[PDB]
Symmetry: D2
């Protein structure tokens, strides 16, 4: 359900596997920002959701270091999986950059991504 390949509105690629233990594992390729190639992602999802037409709560993290570049930053996406034939993961995110203490007030960006399954 969650497992598979997804793209968001920015053109980024999310490849994820949902494990029976509630683990999310995969890779993220961002189409924008201080990024190239694939980054490891790890996260968690509700592996026994409500069956009431509620989405499945999940989240994951990328630290923007790979063996090609390092942006000294990390994003977390928090959201829910909405199943069916046109599956979606609807998220909000927090992108924190490492900063000096004096600059910490401007460390974190916030946004929202919608992911479509392919």
């Amino acid at each position: 359900g969650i497992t598979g390949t997804w793209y968001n509105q920015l053109g980024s690629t999310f490849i994820v596997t949902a494990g029976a233990d509630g683990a999310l594992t995969g890779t993220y390729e961002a189409a924008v920002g201080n990024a190239e190639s694939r980054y490891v992602l790890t996260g968690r999802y509700d592996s026994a959701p409500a069956t009431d037409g509620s989405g499945t709560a999940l989240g994951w993290t990328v630290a923007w270091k790979n063996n090609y570049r390092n942006a000294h930053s990390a994003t977390t996406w928090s959201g829910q999986y909405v199943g069916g034939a046109e599956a979606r993961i609807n998220t909000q995110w927090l992108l924190t950059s490492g900063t000096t203490e004096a600059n910490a007030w401007k460390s974190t960006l916030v946004g929202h991504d919608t992911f479509t399954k392919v």
Copy 2:
């Protein structure tokens, strides 16, 4: 280092290991909310931070299901580690509950947690 046992301003306990190449693995025990006992967490951190005085970017996720309870929700914390005599993890977090599509506008709480290794 990041590895260790941390406490936030609500009294919740964050036990984590920082793997050499960027993993965060541990458990989270919340002192408030629809939760008891420990929950699995996973995340990532910058395993080669800048050497200019900046903190270490990191984040992690908890889905609030364990053998005791299931709140049908997940929190992600996004922040940075600040080393020093009084090491600190400063975060902002997003707590998404599963909801119907309709109620999705009120699905996500936002807040901020600071962590230190000082037991309450």
Copy 3:
């Protein structure tokens, strides 16, 4: 440009006037939550924006008290106006409810609204 009537994806109605001094004034009618009828809004916008294809920064607040109900809560929308023939105000928001100190960790909801001019 900004002045006029707007609706968002939830079906809420935003009626605003942009003053020459950078003031935003108007009324908000929410289609969801603990709300009925029109609420006062006040806000600010950049009254001398960049002319570079950058949007116009703005924000506004509603306290969810009117002479019909009171939700003991307030939303702020922060975002930018994107002009032209299909004008949009793209926003993120923070909805804080009054809470006891022990409950303050769960005081604030976050989301995002897109407004279309009519």
Copy 4:
């Protein structure tokens, strides 16, 4: 009350008047960022809060244009006032810069400011 002169943890000065029926009117002087001197602010607050111990919901906006500078940005603070011997305004804020549509994903900073009437 909410009316008065407030300072946050960055040292920025928030001078506000709470109108009887819900207005917030004042000035904001930021101690960090692309700003100097005072900026106009406006907002709203709950003029009949609950009587159970809860805080007073409020919010306000600053667009960062004044006679000295224009950062082409706006911040909104959303929070609540907590009365008591050490009154406090606890907020979360969103700072949106104008950007092209393309760069809109990195247009908005989020943070948290606490305010008290204690001068730094």
